[PDB]
């Protein structure tokens, strides 16, 4: 559990099953193209600030690759309608992170 | 003749369809699922019935039931699945119900390496059932043989009224290439159908045949009403426990197969004149041997023969004894721990050199050349 981060993934295991990004209420993850590996698409966290205590992602990873920091040693943000709008917009793009998200490498 | 480009399993299915098979049933299992997949599409083309049950026991029981009423049927399995059919095979041996069972060998024992090649089902199929048993087992060893051997197996099963095994191999099944097969007219004309007592009176004697021929069984729902069972039956089929009839039944069951030997077993002998060492072998192993003798013959001070039996059981002991007596150097090559070695050594009353390999890999005919140096 790194200090200062809420949700982080392991790039050496994640395969790109499009399951973890399909359950996030806030839509803070996106499947970016990575041609170094076989499948070619890997999950990258884009908005760690908007992470909610919904452990669902780790509950929906059949690969043991994504982890979320605990409630005791970390503080999670609040629920906002902008988070839901962003989640639905990212979901409606075939689970690929939208281009403008790369405005700061998110 | 006709030339096609295909693989072993589709050739086996095509030969089964051409010979006149119209019923198939089994439980799919790797690597013998290809035959089932081909048959499932091939059979509805000609109006046949394809049914898949929950296990292998039902898969062979439905084939036995369909062929009990006068229909051509076959079943296919591989390794462990065959171990689940041995209960019914004996039944088919006792009630004289024809059936053809294809067995695509893999790496035995239990699952182990389910994607390798082995020849461990020889001594197993020599005597798989309890009690007494006389096994008939073929052995295709080439792409061109998966058709003719299948036709011969069907003809033998219909002629002898007994279960017949087809010892296909993973290497032969999965190989791909160009094959030449006989034409439609001759294949259809060579077909042998089971004999039926037409007569004018009723059957009255389905099992009352001579001491050296199989029983005649008319189809169901045709007027002749007889009883079939797995017990020691009499002339009609009703179970009995008399000593004379019980002994005569098994005596006739053995004699009906051991007396037609001249038509049952074929074997290919090449370079047997003046040879010093024989490389007697069977099955897909020959696919390596035939190549090695092509390279060893380029430079050599001796000639090397070859004797490949195309029918494993019953064994051709009469020819094996003469071959062993004639020559001095013998070498048996197999893909197991010497299971067919036992019969070769029992024949010719002699001890021979052995070369085996049971790690799931092939022979790599460079090994044949290395071993021939001794």
């Amino acid at each position: 559990t790194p200090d200062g981060v809420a949700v982080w993934v392991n790039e050496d295991r994640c395969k790109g099953c499009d399951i973890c990004v399909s359950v996030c209420p806030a839509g803070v993850l996106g499947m970016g193209i990575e041609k170094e590996r076989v499948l070619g698409k890997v999950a990258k966290v884009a908005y760690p600030e908007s992470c909610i205590g919904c452990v669902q992602c780790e509950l929906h990873c059949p690969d043991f690759a994504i982890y979320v920091a605990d409630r005791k040693d970390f503080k999670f943000a609040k629920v906002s309608k902008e988070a839901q709008e962003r989640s639905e917009k990212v979901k409606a793009n075939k689970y690929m992170l939208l281009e403008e998200t790369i405005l700061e490498g998110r | 003749m006709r030339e096609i480009i295909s693989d072993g399993n589709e050739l086996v299915a095509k030969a089964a369809i051409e010979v006149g098979c119209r019923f198939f049933g089994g439980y799919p299992i790797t690597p013998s699922s290809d035959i089932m997949h081909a048959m499932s599409v091939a059979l509805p083309k000609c109006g046949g019935h394809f049914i898949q049950m929950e296990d292998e026991i039902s898969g062979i029981s439905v084939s036995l039931g369909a062929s009990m009423s006068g229909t051509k049927s076959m079943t296919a399995s591989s390794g462990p699945g065959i171990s689940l059919k041995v209960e019914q095979i004996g039944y088919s041996f006792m009630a004289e119900i024809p059936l053809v069972i294809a067995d695509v060998m893999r790496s035995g024992p239990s699952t182990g390496m389910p994607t390798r090649v082995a020849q461990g089902d020889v001594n197993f199929l020599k005597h798989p059932i309890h009690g007494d048993f006389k096994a008939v087992a073929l052995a295709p060893a080439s792409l061109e043989e998966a058709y003719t051997e299948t036709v011969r197996a069907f003809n033998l099963a219909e002629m002898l009224m007994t279960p017949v095994f087809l010892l296909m191999d993973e290497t032969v099944g999965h190989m791909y290439g160009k094959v030449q097969i006989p034409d439609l007219e001759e294949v259809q004309k060579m077909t042998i159908n089971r004999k039926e007592f037409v007569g004018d009176k009723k059957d009255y004697k389905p099992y009352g045949v001579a001491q050296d021929e199989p029983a005649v069984l008319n189809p169901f729902f045709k007027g002749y009403r007889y009883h079939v069972s797995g017990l020691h039956h009499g002339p009609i089929g009703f179970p009995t426990e008399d000593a004379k009839i019980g002994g005569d039944l098994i005596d006739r069951l053995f004699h009906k197969i051991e007396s037609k030997q001249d038509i049952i077993n074929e074997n290919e002998e090449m370079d047997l004149e003046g040879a010093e060492i024989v490389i007697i072998a069977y099955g897909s192993v020959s696919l390596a041997v035939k190549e090695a003798l092509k390279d060893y013959h380029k430079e050599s001070k001796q000639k090397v023969g070859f004797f490949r039996p195309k029918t494993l059981w019953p064994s051709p002991a009469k020819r094996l004894k003469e071959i062993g007596d004639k020559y001095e150097k013998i070498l048996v090559i197999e893909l197991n721990k010497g299971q067919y070695l036992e019969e070769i050594e029992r024949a010719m009353q002699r001890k021979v050199h052995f070369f085996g390999q049971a790690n799931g890999r092939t022979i790599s005919p460079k090994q044949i050349i290395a071993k021939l140096k001794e």
Binding site: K15, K35, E36, R37, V38, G40 | I5, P114, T115, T171, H174, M175, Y176, G177, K178, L287, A288, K290, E291, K294, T362, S364, P365, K366
Partner: protein, 184 residues
Amino acid sequence: MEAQLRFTGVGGQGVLLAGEILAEAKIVSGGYGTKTSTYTSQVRGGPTKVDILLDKDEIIFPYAKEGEIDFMLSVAQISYNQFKSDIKQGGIVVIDPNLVTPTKEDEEKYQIYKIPIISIAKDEVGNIITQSVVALAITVELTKCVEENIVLDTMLKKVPAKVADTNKKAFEIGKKHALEALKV
């Protein structure tokens, strides 16, 4: 004999599907060809290989021999690290830089080429499934064991027509990239 080819990859990719096409084309052309596939019990993500033997006379052994495989094409590291020991000294090896990183000893031992087949298939043509058609599109000029017309006809009579047109395009594209691979 003429051709001993080894195509290696990861199960579920599709490159290995272009194996039997070359053997069928050689068989139709008058020679003989045999294909043997080594697959693992793993359905997806497992190393898979295809060995192809092409000759002018009857092929007796469906299996190849160690140290005599003329050509190798790998698009995965797992199978490359395993089935690389059968390549004859100074043989033909093809890989892709995005998925395979070879060692300097293999560079000295071989005449390795670097062509990103998967990227070309997915990005340029638009459909990634045609990658196999691209891959053999290079092999025609790699071992030069068969003419292009027979291969094109065998491709035509082995694919549904609904995409065959664009499939043909992919083939042509591969040819051009093959002509861009011979920088020497």
